Amino acid sequence: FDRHITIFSPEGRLYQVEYAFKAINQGGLTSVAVRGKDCAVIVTQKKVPDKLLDSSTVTHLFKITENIGCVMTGMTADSRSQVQRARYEAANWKYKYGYEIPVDMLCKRIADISQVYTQNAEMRPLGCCMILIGIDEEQGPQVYKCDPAGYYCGFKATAAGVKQTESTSFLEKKVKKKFDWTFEQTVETAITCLSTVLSIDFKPSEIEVGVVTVENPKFRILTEAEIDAHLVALAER
Amino acid sequence: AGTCLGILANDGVLLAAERRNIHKLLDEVFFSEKIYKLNEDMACSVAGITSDANVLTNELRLIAQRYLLQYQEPIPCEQLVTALCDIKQAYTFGVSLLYIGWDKHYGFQLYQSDPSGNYGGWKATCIGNNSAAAVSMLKQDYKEGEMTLKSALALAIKVLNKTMDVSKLSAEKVEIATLTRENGKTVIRVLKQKEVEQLIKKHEEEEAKAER
Amino acid sequence: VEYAQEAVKKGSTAVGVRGRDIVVLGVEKKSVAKLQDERTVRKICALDDNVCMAFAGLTADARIVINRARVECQSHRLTVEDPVTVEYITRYIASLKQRPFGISALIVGFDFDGTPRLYQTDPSGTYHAWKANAIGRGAKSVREFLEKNYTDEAIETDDLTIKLVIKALLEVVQSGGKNIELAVMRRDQSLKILNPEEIEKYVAEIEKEKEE
Amino acid sequence: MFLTRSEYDRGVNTFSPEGRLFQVEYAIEAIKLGSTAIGIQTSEGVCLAVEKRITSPLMEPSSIEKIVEIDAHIGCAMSGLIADAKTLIDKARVETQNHWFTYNETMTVESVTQAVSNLALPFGVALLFGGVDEKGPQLFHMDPSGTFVQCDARAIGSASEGAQSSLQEVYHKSMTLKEAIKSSLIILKQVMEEKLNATNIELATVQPGQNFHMFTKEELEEVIKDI
Amino acid sequence: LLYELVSIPKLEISMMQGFARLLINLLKKKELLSRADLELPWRPLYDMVERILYSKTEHLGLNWFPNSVENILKTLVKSCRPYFPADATAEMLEEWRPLMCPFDVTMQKAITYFEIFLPTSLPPELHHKGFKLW
Amino acid sequence: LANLHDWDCIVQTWPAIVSSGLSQAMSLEKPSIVRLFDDLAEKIHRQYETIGLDFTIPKSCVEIAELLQQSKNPSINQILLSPEKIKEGIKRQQEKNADALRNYENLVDTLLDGVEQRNLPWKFEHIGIGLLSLLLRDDRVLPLRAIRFFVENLNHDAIVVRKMAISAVAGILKQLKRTHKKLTINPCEISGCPKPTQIIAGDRPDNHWLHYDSKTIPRTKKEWESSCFVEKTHWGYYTWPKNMVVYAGVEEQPKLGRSREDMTEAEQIIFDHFSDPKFVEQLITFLSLEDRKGKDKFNPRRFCLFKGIFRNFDDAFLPVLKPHLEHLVADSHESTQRCVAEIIAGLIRGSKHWTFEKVEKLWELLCPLLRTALSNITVETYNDWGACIATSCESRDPRKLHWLFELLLESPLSGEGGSFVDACRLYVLQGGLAQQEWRVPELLHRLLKYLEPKLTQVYKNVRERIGSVLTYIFMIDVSLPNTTPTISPHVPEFTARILEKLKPLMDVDEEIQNHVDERTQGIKLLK
Amino acid sequence: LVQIEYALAAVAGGAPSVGIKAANGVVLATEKKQKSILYDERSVHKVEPITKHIGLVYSGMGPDYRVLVHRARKLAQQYYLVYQEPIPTAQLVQRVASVMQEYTQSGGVRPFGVSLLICGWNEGRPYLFQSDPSGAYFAWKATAMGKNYVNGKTFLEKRYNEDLELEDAIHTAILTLKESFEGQMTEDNIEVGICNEAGFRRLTPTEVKDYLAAI
């Protein structure tokens, strides 16, 4: 009914697609991906509100293949569903086509699926954001992000969530000043960015970092001792 | 919008459409066409832009070709119109059609279908822009039962002179199709630029003679 | 249904009577336009070989009813080997829905043994048999004419049946002659759609019985 | 008189807060529109009377059927126009014949009424199945809701309740079939107020001996000779 | 001034609009004049409405009025009506009372002229020359 | 800026807006340019107001304006107005409404110069004629060349220009009408009765001479010239006016039958066109042509064309027209019967002011024409003769056109043609007796006396017309206050005779509804 | 339908696309501004090949656009399966506009918010076409799309001529974007594709940079 389903407004807008980005902000959580010379990291925060909850199960970092990882931001069940669909499309690319799916092709595929939600009126847009990282064989580190509108793009760095705009301002002042690279700095840039806009001076039980490197393209989820090894190195400077 | 004439004679039929371009750079290689051959012995013109025109025209061609596949004969002309008007009855295409044809049962023919699924046989008619002006100008001057293609082309350019909007009737702005029988074969001849020039200059010579 | 029934009353008057060895079925043929060809407007359509039908109402909706009944006459003839009863194809036409169509239909003809039948379908599907009936514009007054003049001695010969139909149409059809369309059957033969000359002869013998 | 509607009526598939489907309610109390039709079950057979309401004398009275033959032992009188009933009638005929094909026996009036009522699950036809089976003569009313019930006198149609209150009073268990036919004609003449002749009423009986039998014009006028 | 000048028998109706709109605006607040200050006649208003409401040449296409005229003259006469002479009712009832045949379209003319013109706000010292006369 | 108010801005703009059709930087092939000239011609015709040509402030407005420029509550001390420049004011105003005249007659001429300019597309001449159609004045007659133009394109090959020309030439014949003189009758000077006070409406003794009575129609030139002929159908029903106009006798009326040398030289153009066979055959060919099939009507615009023809010339054109309308009632076409109904209506209404010999010659013509035309009435045709006859006797004296009623109440319910012509001739007659309300008491009694034997004997489409006709028969018996009981048929007197006839249906034992004695005909009456 | 006009409202809000039909080819330049410096401009492409001889570009909604890029490429290759001949450009526009019309007839969906500029080269002869969200298609000499397309369509109507070469048509397609760019275009923030006899190709940014240096 022109603002209830995904049809055009008189000025050409899709209001349910606009409200899915409001729904991403409902989670309260901000994710940041930055990209280095031979590395691409994803950092999100790990606010665990209930203390008798198993914190090893609350995670927004997801393995898609061995070489491709993923941080999700938004409505959490929508996020797990879009992760299962990405895992399906990755395995089916490998089966049909005989090689591992590129990060741009997976992110393009998930955005192509999201367009269908934005165009058929009987289902809603799936109100969450996927950021895919992974190492391309010919292009190096790739950071791709698809939104509930069905857009995707490649990103020198990006952010998703509540403090997305200020994280974008931080990283945008950052990447025109330096060419941020090296394994250590790129985790530094993605920890400082999250910390600056949340302003809460991290302890490692509170964020979680996922990396890919060109030297080992396996998607790793950082150990809490390793987030300590970055937070101590960042917190004395 | 668009408009076209259709005039039945004793030795043939014609369609006489507009070629008016809405913008100075629309190419016209694509928009030049307005007459649509449907089979070996039948043609049509639409009231509308080229996209839904082709959607109607290819369905008409497909009905004519499956008739030819069944019977190895061309489809009789009222029967193709009946087939498409039965397609347009089930959809109640805001487009009207104007058919010229020849079949072995009924000779030269001139049909006109509406969007609602009806059709009618006419002896002269117009669909599209200034339709009522053209048929009111045509009902005066169409001589029933005694007109030839020379008088039919004269009526076509006389009616299009004072019903087309183009402000100077030239051969670049009119497509004329002429469907005659030549020694056992139907000839749908889209009548070309030099002959439309010769028929406009012969018309203008008659009006400038009657002005004296 | 009520929309479809008010579509009928606007339509042309159709009269059918059933005789001893003839069923006659006459429709007001109507001046359509001037440059219109009146061949395409039928209004009397043969269904099988022994079942004819006149309708009143929308001619786009009628044509699909005529086509479906005309296919099912042959399908019945292909599954059961015998011709349709007028009861059968009347019950099939009244069973047709689309909406209902928007026609009423007088369905005359002969069954295999040789019995004349006359049946009348409504848009609500509630057919029933008649000895004489009218549908269309002015139908109740023509039916009131026919509860006075349908006697045994007015239908006892073959020509007085045709003249009963003409006198019934000549109530509401005020052109007096040329503007009515007849069709008789005369069992085991065919339709015999009456000429404008034969209708004019019958009108002349009806008029000659009016100075007396 | 005036207008009394609420927010809970004419919702097509929606319960009211009192568990009621008022879209269906008003579409059952709009099938009173049919002409009156009285069936009476007696021990000598069941009788079925219905008024015919012929329009014109150019029209065959034998061409509008308000009592049909379902099988040789079951007749049915509908109220309403025939074209609404005719899928239920054809369903009943096909069900009797499939029951014969599989089982080599005549289907009971209750099972025919149940097989029609399954197809009625509205459909807007009140029917009166009268017939004779191994349980004697039986009459079954089936309202447009799909609810069927054996009843030993029943009037459906335009004046169903005013005729039903008369059927509550003339009927008794020891009633002969001729008394039932005379009583059904008296109540049809009462709810009709017209003169009673063989052009505005149909009548059919299903007896234990003979088959389904529609009265002819000569046999019908002998009944109204003493009404 | 703008009453004698809005009612000129062959005045241009186009610029009569402005004279009438001022003249409505000058008689709009009725409590400022008192019938002892103003006694505007009713006859040049009636000849004005006949020329423009029941025109004999507009339907033949010879006049072409502005579209908002009827609505601005029916209030222009409504404005001037509480200042008509006392005798006007009795001379509006010898001139439209002949038109009161209920079988044709001229009864409509009578009752439109009564609904526009016939005075209803007179003091009770002369109700007998107002509504108790019709 | 295209329809500003002055003359000096229309005389510039309208010839520019018609003459911009041959401009060579102009393209009607663009669909926005056609939309704007249709918007330009559409807006001007929607917003033109007639302009000027006379502004003369009388000696009542200047009297009350001197007092306003000498009031001294608030003032600037301004001098008394010199009569030298109360002369320059008249001087400037008399030459200001003189080039209003010059600009009007210039604008007409240069619209005419522009609308036929050697190669101009048909849009721009259809624009330039409608703009020219806005200039039918009524203060003046139209310019002689424009009279020539609108008369010569009655038969124009475009139907749009033909309808503009029909409207324009009806306006011309109204501009060119000669004023008919009126006298004053005392209505108790022809009736001879005291014309009582305590005003009573309805059929009175001073009202009675104005009723149609079948024993007092003139039938001679002497009883016609000595007769009153109150034309309107409302005068004297309620009360008489202060003075009452008569339409005085032919000896003082404008003389008719002029021989084209006496005509006013713009009557010359209409005479020299409407009197030759070639213009009339093209006019009636174009004017008997179908326009919108199924949607065509009586069109009172074309009735006003022929009412004005037979109101200014009246005698010489019907010998040119008699073969054309003699041919035209015999056609069983629809639009030919449309054409002759408009001509017959305007020819009957046009003969309002004629001599007895000339209306006598008119009705010797029109009686077989109307007999053939009502016998050949059709479903495509019946509500066009119902508009012809109701138009032809609206606002006319019933005694003057008594030939209509004798043609048309002779046998409306006769039987040739069967039903539906009994119903429609009794409908065409219905509008005729409907327009002549309260003033034809008998002939409504003649219709009631004719048609009470026929309520039983008639079909379904006719007793609907019988019912509508009995409604228009008993309209005049009103219970309106202070109304004298009418000479027209009384509705209680009739339905008592119905209640006599319908008595055997409402008695005891309640058996009804057979419709198959004095009972089934009672059912037929009750229908 | 009203959704077709509202879908054209989403086209006119999109970025400018300009396509010019030269004598020996067809250009298709578009507006490709990145919202910030964080976005890799190398990643996503607006000018897009359909065949080796047909490319296209859009204005409006990119995700709607990829749905018809995928289906134009499917219709093209299922033509090539049948005929083993590269599809004519006009035939492909009929197929694609039939697809783009299907989503206006069916309820429960919306139209595409995208309008395509299909270019082509077949039988030694270039083609410029525009498919609207209604499903209607028009052949063009030159046209604009997206934001202020009206002003672009009259800027083109002034600088278009028929004896125009492909390089000069690249020059006057950059200028039509530059009349509405808002802030100094570069080789990284526009995107041009050309058809010629050699087939369709999207110009490399090093090749766009020299065209921009020539202006």
Ligand SMILES: O=P(O)(O)O[C@H]1[C@H](OP(=O)(O)O)[C@@H](OP(=O)(O)O)[C@H](OP(=O)(O)O)[C@@H](OP(=O)(O)O)[C@H]1OP(=O)(O)O
């Ligand atoms: O003959 P009618 O159709 O009833 O028309 C008359 C006629 O006007 P036309 O001649 O222009 O049709 C009168 O003019 P005369 O014949 O008396 O010269 C005219 O009277 P005025 O010219 O004095 O106005 C009168 O108008 P009215 O009734 O207002 O007096 C008007 O009648 P309609 O108003 O019914 O047309």
